[PDB]
RNA sequence: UUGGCACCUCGAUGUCGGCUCAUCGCAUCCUGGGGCUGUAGUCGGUCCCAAGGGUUGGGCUGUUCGCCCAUUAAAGCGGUACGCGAGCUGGGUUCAGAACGUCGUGAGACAGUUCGGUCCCUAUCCGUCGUGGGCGUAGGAAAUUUGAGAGGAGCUGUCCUUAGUACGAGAGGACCGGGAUGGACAUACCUCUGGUGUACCAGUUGUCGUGCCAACGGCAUAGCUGGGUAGCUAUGUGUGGACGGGAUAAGUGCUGAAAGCAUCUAAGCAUGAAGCCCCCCUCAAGAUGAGAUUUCCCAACUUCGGUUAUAAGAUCCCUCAAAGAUGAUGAGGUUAAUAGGUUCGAGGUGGAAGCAUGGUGACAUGUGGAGCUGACGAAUACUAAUCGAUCGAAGACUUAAU
RNA sequence: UAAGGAACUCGGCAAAAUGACCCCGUAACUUCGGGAGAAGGGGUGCUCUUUAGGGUUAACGCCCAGAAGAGCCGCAGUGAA
């Protein structure tokens, strides 16, 4: 029910090894405009 | 009789002479070919290696398992054959038969043969409680608060721990299962099917691996 | 069209010498029972309660009052133990499964003709 | 599918009418019994006269259940009620006259005298 | 089929509403799981509309809620009339299709994947 | 077990019986193997070996315990904080109310009866059940595998033949062999029998709406009622454990001295248990001892400090299900049948709407096994699986044969 | 929710079942008021005729039918709450 001992800095930081986010798909809109998300459509700010 | 691979189609029934009902499983086993053959001098044990059903040829930018890749192409071409989906080894057969490249036909088996079938059982997700281990419920009534949980897990002090075989929730799932001493009811050479008496593991259109019975 | 291979491999065991009927009809079924050293024919006559299934797996059920007691028999439609089936009368009903007959009695469980 | 505490209907003229089942004979842990099985029972209702009185503990054989039985050719014989017949320690009936139909599975149990007296065996 | 976080009658209700406003506007914006479900509800309506007879006009009235459209030249017609009138004559030779889905980015308030379902 | 002692715990080690779930000992209840018998046969008595598996439903009491009713091959005795309340209950007893008996001058008391009486906690660490990411395994990959080790399984009844034979005055009645079938348990599956089946078909009540009739929609538990596909299922359908080899226990022996005889033992040689090791089923090279086979791929710059660009091969992303908490697994990504709109079927329901005819009318008949139809089988690129990006090797030394 | 129907449990706890209206019938006991809604039975939709009282009213008509026949439909007629 309750923690018996406090958690140290090193154990807390080991537990957060996998707690991250990843970079998205990001294909480039060739005809006009900047990057867009892949398999998506950007009617404005992109020709694709 | 010795060994063959096939897909599971479904179940039906057949009337045996003397007019008794026989439940039956339809197994379709076409395109069995002998690939590499292993020997005790090269490998340490005797076996033959069989491939079941053919996929498409190598394509430059394939992206699924529908097309063979270069190593599978080479391996399946060393014996003059097309690439296969499934490949298994049979150690119970006599290796001095079966030239490499032969076709294993469905009539190697005959009606009345006793066989063993090996599939992968089918897929039940996290189910654990009284479904996984066939355990009893608690009362549904008088004051209960205990319905589908597991019981106690262990003792006090003496075992300050649980034990290595304790039965707890954790996915039913898809193990490998062998059913022994079934029987061949009928062999159909034009459609390339075998009728097995009973039921065999796995979902429809899964791989079955028939072998002669060891007992 | 159940599945090509299943229908192909069981097609040799379908019978063709069977009349058409539907639930509500009265039937006479000539059953071939095997005694010790004989093959006697025995007749079961009743009303068709239901028909389920398809292909070689099809079955039907007939109900009768024997000695004050209701009795039901279920047969596979294509079994070779049935030597003959004849339709005695056509009833007029309004559903496929006549389960309500199980609670009726006397002359309340009569079926209309036509 | 007859288990302990099931009420049955007696189908002979031995005096009993509405026996209640105490035990399913067979082996340890056995739960249910069907057509052709022997049970131990107690008489809950009876006619004046008769050989069996009331609160007697007797043995009966099941004929005619409501769940029915399945035959090897794939056909079924469900009935409309549960019934039984009180027997005399050698599979011989205790009464002398059997009512209603019985199933042709007692014949493979050496219950020949019961099948002989039955009006209809199906 | 898929439950859309609703009960049986809330689901059926908002699915008729989604199918009706697509026939009015030809083009609507919604979430992805809803689009993938209304896709197959709208095309059966268009199938009913291409048959044209009275028996099918009455089957289409079980869906297709009840609205008035005010087109140019002050023409007022119902949704059931617009369907059987011009939507059916448009796709009189397609053999299926009739709709396409286009994905957009995630919505701000929640992470929902936004989508445009249009009428080809 | 009832006690003796007072060593841990009074800034809490918090409860009898039952339920759920077990695990160990053997001083053995059943099943296996034997010796003796005051063992004729069938049954028994007593002792020795043996822990593999098995070891029941009710009535009465809060009851442990016990008595009784029916079974069974058998209904073993103990340890685990008299196993198990951060897993459950709360009948009993050390709580406030009330009453009886009894004791007390009384307030009250008994350990005597009786009726009523609040069961808290979101799991940090070890442990256990499932499931992934990283690196390693002297080049990098794809697939198929050996098995050091580990887990699972391990029960037993009745009937028929030998044979009414052996035994026995008779009554009664076998050993050893050979066949059928069951009970309980395990685990795979949905053809059959059933259950469910809230986007399938039909009937029907009240009220509101679509202007009215007809036909429909909403709400009333899915309004209610009768059926029911796929999937998931037991009470349904299949299969398994009574085999065989090796070494042993109690026991039985052969030859054989010490000890001119005798003696199973001291040298030697056999035999002998549902127990030990294999045989049967599953996992298994993180087995850092990191194994084996088949096939695929192979570069330059360079200050080789590393930089690039890559190969075989993967992945991001997208369409999915025979898979699934997520991730993982498997089917596909246009040189395409992955979803699955359209067309055709299977199965389900049970005779649509409209019109016509008969009837005073409620209604009936015809057109017509009609119409409708989620998940199941086919066919068909009509809609969507676009264009792209990322990752990814360059085979070291020493010695001996060649 | 098959088959069974208290075998559950300290204890039928919880759930299931009864339920509106009309007609018939109703025990022991009793302080003669009761018990009593004792228990236990049967019925109910729609259409058309005949009757047909309250007669709504001038009146059949307004309206419950006051009631009896003859028909029609369903698995089911206080068809839901």
H or E segment at E101?
strand E99-106
Token digits of residue B134: 């066939």
Name chain A's partners: 3 or more CB pairs within 8 A: E
State yes or no: chains B and C have 3 or more CB pairs below 8 A.
yes
Q: Which residues of E touch A41 (CB under 8 A)?
A: 102-104, 116
User: What are the boundaries of each domain within chain D?
Assistant: 1-122
Contact B121, B202 (CB under 8 A): yes
User: What are the boundaries of each domain within chain E?
Assistant: 1-120
Could you identify the residue written with the tokens 């049986």?
A: E8
Q: Locate the chain C residue with the closest alpha carbon to B23.
A: C57
**Torsion-angle region of residue D67: left (phi > 0), alpha (psi -120 to 50) or beta?**
alpha
Q: Which residues contact E105 (CB under 8 A, 6 or more apart)?
A: A37, A40, E113, E114
State yes or no: chains D and E have 3 or more CB pairs below 8 A.
no
CA E72 → CA B12, C78, D4, E77, distances in Å?
A: 63, 67, 81, 11
D45 touches strand G (CB under 7 A): no
Cα separation, C26 vs C113, whole angstroms = 10
Domain that includes residue A20, residue range: 2-48
Return the closest-CA partner of residue B15 out of C10, C2, C59: C10
Cα separation, B63 vs B61, whole angstroms = 6
Q: Domain count of chain B?
A: 1
Quote the Cα angle for D82-D84-D89, to 5°: 155
Strands B32-38 and B103-104: what pairing?
antiparallel
Strands E27-31 and E113-119: what pairing?
antiparallel
Gapped junctions in chain A, after residues (C–N > 2.5 Å): none
Orientation of helix E8-25 relative to helix E32-51, angle to 10°: 70
Q: Locate the chain B residue with the closest alpha carbon to D75.
A: B21
Please answer yes or no on whether D79 and C70 come within 8 Å at the CB atom: yes
Quote the Cα angle for E94-E96-E101, to 5°: 110
Q: How far is B125 from chain C (nearest CA, A)?
A: 28
Q: Which residues of B touch C14 (CB under 8 A)?
A: none
Structure resolution, Å: 2.5
Which letter, b or e, does each residue of E70-100 get, where b requires 16 or more Cβ atoms within 10 Å of its Cβ? eeeeeeeeebbebbbeebbeebeeeeeebbe
Interface test with E, best of A26, A41, A45 (most E CBs within 10 A): A41
Cα separation, E8 vs E117, whole angstroms = 24
- For the annotated binding site of B for Mg(2+), the residues are 136
Cα separation, B51 vs B207, whole angstroms = 12
Cα separation, E32 vs B92, whole angstroms = 54
Cα separation, C4 vs B81, whole angstroms = 28
State the distance between the two ends of chain E, measured CA to CA, in whole angstroms. 24
Cα separation, E117 vs E31, whole angstroms = 10
Q: Domain count of chain A?
A: 1
CA B98 → CA B49, B53, B103, B214, distances in Å?
A: 10, 18, 9, 20
Contact B84, B53 (CB under 8 A): yes
Contact B7, B21 (CB under 8 A): no
Nearest to D120 among C66, C70, C76 (CB): C66
State the distance between the two ends of chain D, measured CA to CA, in whole angstroms. 19
State the distance between the two ends of chain A, measured CA to CA, in whole angstroms. 54
Cα separation, C21 vs C86, whole angstroms = 9
Q: Which residues contact C96 (CB under 8 A, 6 or more apart)?
A: C23, C50, C51
Cα separation, B204 vs B200, whole angstroms = 10
- The size of chain D, in residues, is 122
- Nucleotides on strand F lying under 7 Å from protein C-beta: 19-23, 55-57, 69-75, 80-81, 83-90, 121-133, 141-147, 151-152, 157, 182-194, 198-199, 210, 215-220, 222-223, 226-229, 231-233, 236-241, 280-283, 292-297, 312-318, 320, 322-325, 330-335, 340-354, 365, 369, 371-375, 377-378, 382-389
Rounded, the Å distance between the CA of C22 and C1' of F192 is 21
Q: What is the DSSP string of E25-79?
A: HSEEEEEHHHHHHHHHHHHHHHHHHHH-SHHHHHHHTSSS---EEEEGGGEEEEH
C100 touches strand G (CB under 7 A): yes
Provide the β-strand partners of residue B47: B38
Contact B22, B197 (CB under 8 A): yes
């Amino acid at each position: 029910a309750v923690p018996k001992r406090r958690t140290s800095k090193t154990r807390k930081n080991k537990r957060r090894t996998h707690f991250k986010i990843s970079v998205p798909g990001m294909t480039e809109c060739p005809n006009c405009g900047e990057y867009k998300l892949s398999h998506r459509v950007c009617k404005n700010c992109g020709s694709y | 009789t010795k060994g063959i691979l096939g897909r599971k189609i479904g179940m039906t029934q057949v009337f045996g002479e003397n007019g008794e009902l026989i439940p039956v499983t339809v197994v379709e086993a076409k395109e069995n070919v002998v690939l590499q053959k292993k020997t005790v001098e090269v490998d340490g044990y005797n076996a033959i290696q069989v491939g079941f059903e053919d996929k498409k040829a190598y394509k430059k930018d394939a992206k699924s398992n529908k097309y063979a890749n270069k190593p599978a192409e080479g391996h399946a071409k060393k014996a003059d054959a097309a690439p296969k989906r499934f490949i298994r080894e049979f150690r119970n057969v006599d290796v001095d038969a079966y030239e490499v490249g032969q076709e294993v036909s469905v009539d190697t088996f005959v009606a009345g043969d006793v066989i063993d079938v090996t599939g992968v059982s089918k897929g039940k997700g996290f189910q654990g409680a009284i479904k996984r281990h066939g355990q009893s419920r608690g009362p549904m009534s008088h004051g209960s608060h205990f319905h589908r949980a597991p019981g106690s897990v262990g003792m006090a002090s003496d075992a300050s721990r649980v034990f290595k075989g304790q039965k707890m929730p954790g996915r039913m799932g898809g193990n490998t299962v062998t059913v022994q001493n079934l029987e061949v009811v009928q062999v159909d050479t034009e459609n390339k099917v075998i009728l097995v008496k009973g039921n065999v593991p796995g979902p429809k259109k899964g791989l079955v691996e028939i072998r002669t019975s060891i007992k | 069209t159940n599945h090509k291979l299943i229908e192909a491999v069981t097609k040799s065991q379908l019978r063709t010498d069977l009349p058409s009927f539907r639930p509500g009809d009265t039937l006479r079924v000539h059953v071939r029972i095997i005694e010790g050293t004989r093959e006697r024919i025995q007749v079961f006559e009743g009303v068709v309660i239901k028909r389920r299934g398809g292909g070689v797996s099809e079955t039907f059920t007939v109900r009768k009052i024997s000695s004050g007691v209701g009795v039901e028999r279920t047969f596979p439609l294509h079994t070779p133990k049935i030597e003959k089936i004849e339709v005695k009368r056509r009833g007029k009903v309004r559903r496929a499964k006549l389960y309500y007959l199980r609670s009726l009695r006397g002359k309340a469980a009569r079926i209309q003709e036509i | 599918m007859i288990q302990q505490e099931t009420r049955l209907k007696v189908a002979d003229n031995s005096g009993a009418r509405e026996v209640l089942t105490i035990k399913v004979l067979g082996g340890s842990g056995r739960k249910t019994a069907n057509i052709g099985d022997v049970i131990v029972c107690t008489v809950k209702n009876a006619t004046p006269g008769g050989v069996v009185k009331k609160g007697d503990v007797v043995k009966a054989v099941i004929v005619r259940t409501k769940s029915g039985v399945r035959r090897n050719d794939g056909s079924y014989i469900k009935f409309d009620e549960n019934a039984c017949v009180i027997i005399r320690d050698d599979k011989g009936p205790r009464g002398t006259r059997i009512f209603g139909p019985v199933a042709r599975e007692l014949r493979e149990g050496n219950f020949m005298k019961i099948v002989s007296l039955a009006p209809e065996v199906l | 089929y898929r439950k859309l976080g609703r009960t049986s009658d809330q689901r059926k209700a908002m699915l008729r509403d989604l199918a009706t406003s697509l026939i009015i506007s030809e083009r609507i914006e919604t979430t992805e799981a809803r689009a993938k479900e209304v896709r197959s509800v709208v095309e059966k309506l268009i199938t009913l509309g291409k048959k044209g007879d009275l028996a099918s006009r009455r089957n289409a009235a079980k869906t297709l809620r009840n609205v008035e459209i005010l087109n140019e030249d002050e023409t007022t017609q119902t949704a059931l009339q617009k369907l059987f009138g011009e939507i059916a004559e448009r796709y009189t030779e397609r053999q299926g299709g009739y709709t396409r889905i286009l994905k957009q980015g995630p919505r701000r308030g929640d992470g929902a994947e936004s989508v445009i379902i249009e009428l080809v």
